Every structure is written in structure tokens, then in C-alpha cells.
């Protein structure tokens, strides 16, 4: 049907912000997903401060 504007959401898992979901911002992608949204630890949100997104990190490929 008629389209207005093309936009996206956080987690690569197609899910908007939910104060029940905790995120981590793609250091290189600049976006967020639920820790598990990308298969990461839970506390990974706190014990973290150098996390990168898998969508962006993919380019870094270590």
C-alpha cells in the first residue's frame, strides 16, 4: 500500500524500545539491539564499555 517514510528500529531482531529490553550501541554502527538480540551476555550491558554491533563489527572482522 502507500508508503510514507522508510525507517528502521533498534535490535536487528525487529523490536522497538522496551524498558524490558536492554541495549548496547553499535560502536561502529551507532545502533542498539537487546544483548541477546545479537546473542550476547545479559550483564554484557553493564560490564561493557567497548561493545560493538555485529552489523557494524562485521566490517571490523577483527
Amino acid at each position: 500500500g502507500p508508503l510514507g517514510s522508510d525507517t528502521k528500529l533498534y535490535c536487528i531482531c525487529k523490536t522497538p524500545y522496551d524498558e524490558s529490553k536492554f541495549y548496547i550501541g553499535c560502536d561502529r554502527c551507532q545502533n542498539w539491539y537487546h544483548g541477546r538480540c545479537v546473542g550476547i551476555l545479559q550483564s554484557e550491558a553493564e560490564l561493557i564499555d567497548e561493545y560493538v554491533c555485529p552489523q557494524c563489527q562485521s566490517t571490523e572482522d577483527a
Binding site: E19, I24, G25, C26, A45, I48, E50
Partner: peptide, 15 residues
Amino acid sequence: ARTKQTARKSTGGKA
């Protein structure tokens, strides 16, 4: 990193 988390449960400890 740009960790995006929440802490609504916490109020604010003086220390």
C-alpha cells in the same frame, strides 16, 4: 562503548 541500558529500579545513592 555506547552501551544503552536502564536503571529505573535504582533511585540515587548519595555515595
